PDB file of C-alpha atoms in Angstrom:
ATOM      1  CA  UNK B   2       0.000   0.000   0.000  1.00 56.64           C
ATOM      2  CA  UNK B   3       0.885   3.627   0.120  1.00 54.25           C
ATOM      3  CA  UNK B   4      -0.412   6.047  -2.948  1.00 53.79           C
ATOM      4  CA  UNK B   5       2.785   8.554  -4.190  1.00 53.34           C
ATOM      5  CA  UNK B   6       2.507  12.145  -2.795  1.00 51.43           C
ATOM      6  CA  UNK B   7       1.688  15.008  -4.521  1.00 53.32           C
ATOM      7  CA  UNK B   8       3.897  16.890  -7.234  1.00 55.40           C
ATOM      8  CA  UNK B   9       6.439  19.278  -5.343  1.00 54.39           C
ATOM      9  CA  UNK B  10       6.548  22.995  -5.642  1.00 57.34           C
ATOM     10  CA  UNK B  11       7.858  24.628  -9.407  1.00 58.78           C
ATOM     11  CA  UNK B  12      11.045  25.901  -9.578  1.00 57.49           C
ATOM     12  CA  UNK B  13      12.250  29.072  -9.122  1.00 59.21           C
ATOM     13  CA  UNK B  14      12.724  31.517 -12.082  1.00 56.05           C
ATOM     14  CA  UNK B  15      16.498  31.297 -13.600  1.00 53.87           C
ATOM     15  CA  UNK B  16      18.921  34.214 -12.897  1.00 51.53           C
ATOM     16  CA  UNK B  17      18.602  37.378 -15.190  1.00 51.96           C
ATOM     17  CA  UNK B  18      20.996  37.053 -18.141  1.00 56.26           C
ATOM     18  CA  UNK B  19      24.263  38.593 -18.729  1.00 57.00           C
ATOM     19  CA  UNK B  20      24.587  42.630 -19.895  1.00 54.40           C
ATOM     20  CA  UNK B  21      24.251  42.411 -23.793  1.00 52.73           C
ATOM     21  CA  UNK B  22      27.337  43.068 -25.989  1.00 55.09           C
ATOM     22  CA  UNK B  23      29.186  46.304 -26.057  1.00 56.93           C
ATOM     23  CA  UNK B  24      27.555  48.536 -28.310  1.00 56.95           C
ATOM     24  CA  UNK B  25      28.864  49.610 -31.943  1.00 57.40           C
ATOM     25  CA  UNK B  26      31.627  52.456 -32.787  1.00 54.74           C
ATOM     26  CA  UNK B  27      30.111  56.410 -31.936  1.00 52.60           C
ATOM     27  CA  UNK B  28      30.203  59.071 -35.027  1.00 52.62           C
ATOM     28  CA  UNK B  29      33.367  60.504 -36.508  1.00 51.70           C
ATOM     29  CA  UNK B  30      34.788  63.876 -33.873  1.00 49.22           C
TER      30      UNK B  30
ATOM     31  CA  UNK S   1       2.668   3.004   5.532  1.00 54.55           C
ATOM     32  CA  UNK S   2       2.500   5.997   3.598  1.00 54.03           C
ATOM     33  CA  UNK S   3       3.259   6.317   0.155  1.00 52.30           C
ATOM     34  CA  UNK S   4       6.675   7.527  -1.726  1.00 52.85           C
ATOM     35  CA  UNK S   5       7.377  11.313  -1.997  1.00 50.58           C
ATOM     36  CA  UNK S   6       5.563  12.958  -4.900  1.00 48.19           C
ATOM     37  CA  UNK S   7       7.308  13.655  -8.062  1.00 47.63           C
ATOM     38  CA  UNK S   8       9.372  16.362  -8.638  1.00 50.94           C
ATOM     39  CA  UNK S   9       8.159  19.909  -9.023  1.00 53.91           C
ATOM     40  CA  UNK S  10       7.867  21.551 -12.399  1.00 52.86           C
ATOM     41  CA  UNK S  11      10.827  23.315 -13.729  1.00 52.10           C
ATOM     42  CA  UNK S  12      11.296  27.269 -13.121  1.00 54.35           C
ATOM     43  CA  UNK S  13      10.943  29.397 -16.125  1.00 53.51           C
ATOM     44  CA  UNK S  14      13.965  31.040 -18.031  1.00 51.81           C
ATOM     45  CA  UNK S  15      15.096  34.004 -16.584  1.00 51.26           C
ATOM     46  CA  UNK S  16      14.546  37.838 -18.090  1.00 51.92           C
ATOM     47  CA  UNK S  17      16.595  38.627 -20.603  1.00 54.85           C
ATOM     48  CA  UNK S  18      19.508  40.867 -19.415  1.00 56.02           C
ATOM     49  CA  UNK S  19      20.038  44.668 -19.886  1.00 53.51           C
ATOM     50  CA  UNK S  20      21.447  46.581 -22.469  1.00 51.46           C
ATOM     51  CA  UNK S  21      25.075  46.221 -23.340  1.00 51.85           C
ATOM     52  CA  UNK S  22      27.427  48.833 -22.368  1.00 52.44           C
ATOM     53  CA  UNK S  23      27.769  51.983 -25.115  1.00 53.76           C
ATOM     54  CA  UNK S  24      30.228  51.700 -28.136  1.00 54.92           C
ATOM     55  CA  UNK S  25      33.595  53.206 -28.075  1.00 51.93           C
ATOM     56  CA  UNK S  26      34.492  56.785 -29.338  1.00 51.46           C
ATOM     57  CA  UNK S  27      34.573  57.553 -32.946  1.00 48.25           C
ATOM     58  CA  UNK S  28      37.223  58.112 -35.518  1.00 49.78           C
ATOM     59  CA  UNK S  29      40.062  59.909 -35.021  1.00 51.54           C
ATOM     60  CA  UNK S  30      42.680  58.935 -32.222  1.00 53.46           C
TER      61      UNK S  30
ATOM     62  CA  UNK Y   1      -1.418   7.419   3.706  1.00 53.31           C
ATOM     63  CA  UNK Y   2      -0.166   9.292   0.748  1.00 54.74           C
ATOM     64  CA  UNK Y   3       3.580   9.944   0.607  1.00 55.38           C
ATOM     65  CA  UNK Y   4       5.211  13.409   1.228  1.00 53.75           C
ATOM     66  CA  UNK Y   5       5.636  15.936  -1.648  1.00 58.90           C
ATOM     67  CA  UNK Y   6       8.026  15.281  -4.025  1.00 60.10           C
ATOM     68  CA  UNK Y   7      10.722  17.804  -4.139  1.00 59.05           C
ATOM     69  CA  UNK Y   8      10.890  21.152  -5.676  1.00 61.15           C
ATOM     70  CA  UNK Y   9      11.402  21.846  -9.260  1.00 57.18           C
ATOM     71  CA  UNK Y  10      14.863  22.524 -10.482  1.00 57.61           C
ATOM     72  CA  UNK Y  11      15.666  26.323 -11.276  1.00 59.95           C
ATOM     73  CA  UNK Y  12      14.955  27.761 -14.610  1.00 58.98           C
ATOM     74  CA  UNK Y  13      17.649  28.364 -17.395  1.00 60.17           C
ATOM     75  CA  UNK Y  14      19.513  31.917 -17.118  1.00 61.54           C
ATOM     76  CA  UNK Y  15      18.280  34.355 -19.272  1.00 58.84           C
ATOM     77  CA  UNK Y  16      19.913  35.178 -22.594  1.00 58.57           C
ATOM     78  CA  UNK Y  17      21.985  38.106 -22.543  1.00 63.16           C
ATOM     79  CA  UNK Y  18      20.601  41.568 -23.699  1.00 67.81           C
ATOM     80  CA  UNK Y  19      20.579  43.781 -26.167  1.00 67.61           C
ATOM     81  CA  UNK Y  20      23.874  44.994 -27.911  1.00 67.45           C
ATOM     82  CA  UNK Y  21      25.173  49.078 -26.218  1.00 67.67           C
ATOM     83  CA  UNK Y  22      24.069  51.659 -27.980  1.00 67.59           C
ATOM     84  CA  UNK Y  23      26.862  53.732 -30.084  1.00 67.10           C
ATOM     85  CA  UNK Y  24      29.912  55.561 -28.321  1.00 68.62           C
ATOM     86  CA  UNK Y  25      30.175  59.180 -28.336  1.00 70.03           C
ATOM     87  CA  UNK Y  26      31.974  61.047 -30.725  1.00 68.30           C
ATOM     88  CA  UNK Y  27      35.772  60.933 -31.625  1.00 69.58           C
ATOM     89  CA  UNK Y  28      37.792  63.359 -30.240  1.00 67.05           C
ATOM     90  CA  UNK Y  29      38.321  67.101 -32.293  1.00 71.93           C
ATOM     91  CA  UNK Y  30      40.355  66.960 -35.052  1.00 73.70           C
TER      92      UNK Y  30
END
């Protein structure tokens, strides 16, 4: 005998992600 | 006697995307 | 009896990484 228990708790949401890429050359001084 | 623990809990969700990368560097000339 | 909970979910992925900077400032007068 003995019926399973019920599903546990969901997961936590993952971590933020990382800072994009550094962005492009600025304009000609 | 009691039954075996439940399954396993859903899986979290993907996290936000991150922020902005950081600004470009300075334009032409040295 | 039914058994205990089963555990918690595993945490989601990370997120994917942001948007590219924007553009640098300008170059330095000529």
């Amino acid at each position: 005998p003995g019926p399973p228990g019920p599903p546990g708790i969901t997961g936590a949401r993952g971590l933020a992600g990382p800072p994009g890429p550094p962005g492009p050359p600025g304009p000609p001084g």
